[PDB]
Amino acid sequence: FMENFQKVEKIGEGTYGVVYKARNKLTGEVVALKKIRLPSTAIREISLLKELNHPNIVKLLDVIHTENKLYLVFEFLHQDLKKFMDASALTGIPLPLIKSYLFQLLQGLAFCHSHRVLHRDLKPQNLLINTEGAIKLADFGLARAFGVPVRTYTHEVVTLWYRAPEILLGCKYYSTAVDIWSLGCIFAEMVTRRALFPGDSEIDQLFRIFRTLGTPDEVVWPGVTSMPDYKPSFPKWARQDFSKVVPPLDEDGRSLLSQMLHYDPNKRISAKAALAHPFFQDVTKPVPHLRL
Ligand SMILES: O=C(O)/C=C/c1cccc(C(=O)Nc2ccc(Cl)cc2)c1
Numbered sequence: 001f002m003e004n005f006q007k008v009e010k011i012g013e014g015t016y017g018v019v020y021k022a023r024n025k026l027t028g029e030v031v032a033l034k035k036i037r038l039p040s041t042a043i044r045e046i047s048l049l050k051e052l053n054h055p056n057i058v059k060l061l062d063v064i065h066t067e068n069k070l071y072l073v074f075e076f077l078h079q080d081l082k083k084f085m086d087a088s089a090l091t092g093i094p095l096p097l098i099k100s101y102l103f104q105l106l107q108g109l110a111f112c113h114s115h116r117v118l119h120r121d122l123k124p125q126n127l128l129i130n131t132e133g134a135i136k137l138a139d140f141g142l143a144r145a146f147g148v149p150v151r152t153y154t155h156e157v158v159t160l161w162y163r164a165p166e167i168l169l170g171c172k173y174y175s176t177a178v179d180i181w182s183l184g185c186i187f188a189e190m191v192t193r194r195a196l197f198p199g200d201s202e203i204d205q206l207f208r209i210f211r212t213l214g215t216p217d218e219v220v221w222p223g224v225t226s227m228p229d230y231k232p233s234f235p236k237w238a239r240q241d242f243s244k245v246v247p248p249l250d251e252d253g254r255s256l257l258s259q260m261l262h263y264d265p266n267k268r269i270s271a272k273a274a275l276a277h278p279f280f281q282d283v284t285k286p287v288p289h290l291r292l
């Protein structure tokens, strides 16, 4: 299968398999080629994503099942947000660029959610950027096909840092709200240059959330005490003000972030409603300086 395009390089190691940069011999385009390591139901679910096209979604070019191995062919972008924020650590990112990126990501979410497709595993590593100021969501719809594993194929730990509390509390039904939660965590990280909730176990993840947002109860989250993994013995932390959490973000940004991090997934702001928030009144599309 690797003889029907040149393998420019191994790009790195994704959740499910190796990622290569490759040239498509027929089209001449440079693409990302992801080998998925281990299922007809999955092939059908993923093949449907070839029509889920939007400028803020990494394009799924092809789905190849051969010699019992699965390969996904995607649009290539040169950098991810993790590497960009690491490279930006001494200075931070301009607020206009943070705002542009959040706005664009919300447009991608609004599109996919309107088609009833979730991501479920948003994280900086699957947010790809180009020279023109665009940002795009990678690997949309793959969790519904493959699951979100504990470890990758290389045994690397799959991050918990962006996981919504309903998932951690054992809800089996995911709503689009899980993606808004993850994006809110990413927003906070862009602003502060630190992960919001860098848990290193499921309980550390849930208790970090609680120590910032307060331990949830039936006042803020009806039904929370009946969730599978809820325990009455959870410690009861008081909620922190967002002014201490994400300084120096303004009150428009803090209001939006608070709505993206509501405990109750039914209450959590939708992507479509978020696009109308006053924080985006002055949105623009700045150029990032990328060194490729
Ligand atoms: O404010 C803070 O920084 C901490 C306050 C705080 C207060 C009470 C309990 C805990 C806590 O999480 N304990 C714990 C012990 C065993 C396991 Cl298995 C999980 C959790 C923490």
Ligand SMILES: O=C(O)/C=C/c1cccc(C(=O)Nc2ccc(Cl)cc2)c1
Pocket (backbone or CB within 6 Å): 091, 092, 093, 094, 095, 098, 190, 191, 247, 248, 249, 250
């Ligand atoms: O205009 C330029 O050429 C670059 C300016 C520039 C460069 C780096 C960082 C910043 C900055 O202040 N970022 C920031 C982030 C979050 C909040 Cl909440 C407020 C501010 C600005």
